[PDB]
Write a protein that binds this ligand. Structure first.
Ligand SMILES: CCn1nc(C)cc1C(=O)Nc1nc2cc(C(N)=O)cc(OC)c2n1C/C=C/Cn1c(NC(=O)c2cc(C)nn2CC)nc2cc(C(N)=O)cc(OCCCN3CCOCC3)c21
Ligand SMILES: CCn1nc(C)cc1C(=O)Nc1nc2cc(C(N)=O)cc(OC)c2n1C/C=C/Cn1c(NC(=O)c2cc(C)nn2CC)nc2cc(C(N)=O)cc(OCCCN3CCOCC3)c21
Ligand SMILES: CC1(C)C(=O)N(Cc2c(F)cccc2Cl)c2cc(C(=O)NCc3c(F)cc(F)cc3F)ccc21
Ligand SMILES: CC1(C)C(=O)N(Cc2c(F)cccc2Cl)c2cc(C(=O)NCc3c(F)cc(F)cc3F)ccc21
Lengths: 306, 311, 311, 306, 63
């Protein structure tokens, strides 16, 4: 609802389509007309190599982690083992389960040399790479995103400090003058393009700076929303200052934060600001978000919510 | 370098294990003396299952992304496949290799290719639903650090682009102006940014330790800064412009709220990571040309002892 | 899109067509009917032949590099090895597989390892001596433009960082001031930078075409800007702040000298590329907030028309 | 002559040691003791595959240039073929020479298809990549290096315009102020780490600003060189600005310019500026370059040149 | 009257002024106050000069 080009939280399409594929997959195994004794042996041995390979992958990971004991895991060996190999208990059972069934199921020592060699090629040539559309899912589900830190810093830092003392300063400026009364809500502008001009008239000339709201120290502007050369309304406009910071990351070569990522993350920052302003006690319909990506009259969009 | 506890950027110990492992792999293959020809096919066939799996897994992962395409992938089909399947042309060739390496190759162990198609699909769904192929927390922190997906990365950079970048150019002159109009000791020209690893950031700096006491407000948008003196044994041991790290404070309040999904285990990592990233940004930035020095520690001891040794 | 002559950055057509040839080549492998056991073995063996040769060639490449360690590689040997042999931990992971797949695998065609190693160095030595395995310019041009190995990339970024990033913020203010204090048409608020692709840069802009002539130097680290009137049919259709691009002059003078090793055709290659690099830089820079305009033309026509059509 | 850290112009350590490596490897062929016709045909077939290897790489690259033909090659198919395949006839003649040797020397059509397929995997996967050592071994030879541009333009634009009239301005300044004449040479500092403060005082307090030389407008500042609290030299100091641009080039992400390249090109920029000023009419011992790198006394570095 | 620029250059610096009229530029000439009149005013300001206001006015006219 915030904007047609803001991504919704990831749903369960992967779960549902897999279920449909799983339903259709189990159908076609029955069509072969073959006993499932081989199928069960194949499936168990198919999983056995993965668990065996996962151990060596953890072991290969651990050799980097062995010198990391004093750095990340409080100088503890057991915690380091858990990080690479997952839960030691559940993983440990799978290791012994595979070995016992592998010997029973009809070489013995040749596969480990080959499987250990195969795990090397995944580590060395990077065949088992992470698809970014699965990097995004895990990063978003675990809240490993840069935007999730830019929004929470904004809310805890700026919004949660002026929102209580905003409607009061709006009311006082309304009585102290006579003007069309200014709206009692802050209309945060969230330019999705992350190009934030230092003056509002630069984005559109029909929006003009009129006055500064009386006042830790904060300064806000009231803008003369002009339609057909006449005032149609007034409000307090304010760009999201993180949207500059996300932009100025993309310029710098040290950020490792490219243009495709800049737009991709800045989409989250607005989404994870609505999810914050929805439940925040300081938000009592006293702050209204407006987003717009230039394909546009900025003045009408402010009027659109008015 | 900043502290014995701050993690170092990952080395190449991963492939170091693999190369040593491969050294123990070729010898083991040579020691057992297996038929070399079938050893070649088996490794390829094994990699034929692995790379054909990344398509069945990808397509299931692709199903959801076809509904974000208008917003997340700017309404383009080719920016949907490249996110779920890596580079398409590079990945597309490997599939034709794996298909060719499985369509008609002799295979003592393994089903025919048309049989293996069904067995692969059933295997992928089981791993997806149960999460058997779960990401290890060691690799989660490894990939995110490499691709810069950690939340402390932004909080370190935003603390630079917003505040640190805008005040270091004038901080030397502002400190110089105060010293020339004050006592004949003197205040150091280097800013100090406290980075308590515990993220315990008292509102008043003097309350952390009695030896550090607020002296004066440094003269000048209001960029207020309070200069502090370090009272060691009742005498003016040293004075410097000291402040806490606001992003660490915002991290501390981040973990408290339950709408952030920020456990205290994660906050400790980002408390450490935010220091190293701030070390990296200030290492080469033109503004931080020996203009700022960072203080990081973990409270188990006096804070004044650590700041004094830096002067 | 500035001019039809300027080239676009290299695409992925080479990878795209290679997929088609891979697809058609798969048909012939399935049509002739040779056993896949030998086809898989040869293909691994053939790929083994190419990879194993790169070792000695890299060794001969490293041979000159042993004395460059003190100068071009900061005194570390392992940085030198990666420079010549590619990734040390990956290429060695491919040589070892080819060593195992040639010391053990059957070799229906080709010498044994004890024999191939003799011939392997011989072919590379001849290629090094005679330069037979040479890089055609399209391979060099691709590496030059992908890895930013050009002199135009140098000039464009220098031109922006040194000149265009320092007057564009202050260009709008002076144009507004000049328009405000004088009431005789109006001057556009944009600098219409002229980019003559032929690198013909006269000192006097009015001499280029009669319709352009000097009006008044624009009042203001002492930047001299001359605005011009565009006499169309003897009528001042419009006036603008107009100037040439100095680097495109310094590309011309580079080709004149015989010490630069910068041929006439190379000048054209690094002149078209330079203009594209400037647009890619201005279109993303914050300073060019609709503040600068590019006018690129290759002389086959009046200069005033294109300047006018952009107004 | 300039600095130990400056890379020397590429000698011939390859041919010096490759031939020696060949000489040791030329003895071993006589050691094996094998028939010569068998050896002869293998080598010919080896070069026959490479000719097709070069043919397929160029032809695949030719498919891309059908979009750049009207831009890079002036709409002429001849330059399109020449850039990709090298010489249209010399390369073409080798192929049929190789093919005729291919069939003459002891399947045929299936071998050609396999060779084409194996070249496709070379292109898509990119195993046969260009090593960084040979990337900087061709660009240096072909003068396709970024710092070469920032060097010559710094000459045609700045050095060639101020050097002829510098000594006159120094002579005028030396006459006007008596007692401690300045050196008649322009000292262009070249800090190889590219750390260029706006003023020399921040780099080292032992160097003092003295005055600005009389004068478009050219401003050169004369700097005092102090030693143990007393003057030791006076000369015109001016950082090579392209080093500052090179340092700021690596800062921005759109430059595609790494940190090592900054260090690598800064080393190159002095050496190509050495070559220009070695054989230039505007160099009459009136301009001596200073290059240094902290692994220090910058102030004492200048005195060694005096 | 608007300041325009400084005349090109012991060194002597002089100023050229815009002579605005009805909002348009109508003339350009070098305007430079007679500093001795400023000196006379400062003389009348201080009490050690023994130099009254009418004295300053009359000396301005004679100057
Ligand atoms: C982006 C920098 N950054 N990233 C992280 C992570 C931490 C910091 C950081 O260090 N910021 C900070 N600390 C300061 C300390 C002093 C001082 N001691 O004098 C002075 C400063 O500059 C004025 C300080 N600044 C910068 C300005 C900051 C707060 N602020 C913001 N929000 C952000 O910038 C922002 C972006 C993101 C992402 N998250 N945030 C929230 C912090 N919008 C504002 C609009 C107005 C206006 N229209 O007038 C006035 C503001 O502040 C004046 C009042 C200062 N108050 C409040 C804070 O505490 C000190 C006293 C505004
Ligand atoms: C081509 C020479 N070159 N190649 C490389 C690589 C680096 C340099 C170089 O550094 N040259 C330089 N250094 C100077 C220092 C002084 C001084 N007083 O110290 C005086 C000079 O002469 C005026 C200086 N010059 C020459 C002219 C320089 C600057 N300038 C340019 N630049 C380019 O065209 C150009 C080409 C390439 C390639 N990259 N660039 C961007 C730098 N265009 C201009 C147009 C106008 C006008 N229309 O009026 C006015 C200019 O000068 C006013 C600005 C003076 N500022 C500049 C920097 O800060 C201090 C002084 C212009
Ligand atoms: C490295 C080595 C020797 C190995 O250890 N395995 C594990 C394994 C089995 F998978 C199957 C049986 C025995 C073993 Cl022992 C393996 C498999 C193949 C292969 O082609 N598997 C096809 C395949 C399946 F059989 C089932 C499935 F669900 C998917 C699938 F894609 C090639 C080489 C190996
Ligand atoms: C694709 C196919 C069938 C092909 O066309 N050739 C060309 C060719 C020769 F190069 C050599 C002989 C016959 C043919 Cl017929 C080839 C070669 C190999 C191979 O293993 N070459 C090893 C190898 C050498 F023989 C000489 C050398 F100096 C180094 C070296 F590394 C594998 C498959 C093929």
């Amino acid at each position: 609802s915030l904007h047609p080009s803001i991504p919704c939280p990831r749903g369960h399409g992967a779960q549902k389509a897999a279920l449909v594929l799983l339903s259709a997959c189990l159908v076609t195994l029955w069509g072969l007309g073959e006993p499932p004794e081989h199928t069960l042996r194949y499936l168990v041995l198919h999983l056995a190599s993965l668990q065996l390979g996962l151990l060596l992958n953890g072991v290969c990971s651990l050799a980097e982690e062995l010198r990391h004991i004093h750095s990340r895991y409080r100088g503890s060996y057991w915690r380091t083992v858990r990080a690479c190999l997952g839960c030691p208990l559940r993983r440990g059972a799978l290791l012994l389960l595979s070995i016992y069934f592998y010997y029973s199921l009809p070489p013995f020592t040749w596969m480990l040399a080959l499987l250990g060699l195969s795990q090397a090629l995944n580590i060395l040539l990077g065949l088992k790479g992470l698809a970014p559309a699965e990097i995004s899912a895990v990063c978003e589900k675990g809240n490993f995103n840069v935007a999730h830190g830019l929004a929470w810093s904004y809310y805890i830092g700026y919004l949660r400090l002026i929102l209580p003392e905003l409607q009061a300063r709006i009311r006082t400026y309304n009585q102290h003058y006579n003007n069309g009364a200014v709206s009692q809500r802050l209309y945060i502008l969230l330019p999705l393009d992350c190009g934030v001009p230092d003056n509002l008239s630069m984005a559109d000339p029909n929006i003009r700076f009129l006055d500064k709201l009386p006042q830790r120290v904060y300064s806000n502007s009231i803008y003369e929303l002009l339609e057909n050369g006449q005032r149609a309304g007034t409000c307090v406009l304010e760009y999201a200052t993180p949207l500059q910071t996300l932009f100025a990351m993309s310029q710098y070569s040290q950020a490792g934060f490219s243009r495709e990522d800049r737009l991709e993350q800045a989409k989250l920052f607005c989404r994870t600001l609505e999810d914050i302003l929805a439940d925040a006690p300081e938000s009592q319909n006293n702050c209204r978000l407006i987003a717009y990506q230039e394909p546009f009259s900025l003045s009408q969009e402010v009027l659109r919510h008015l």
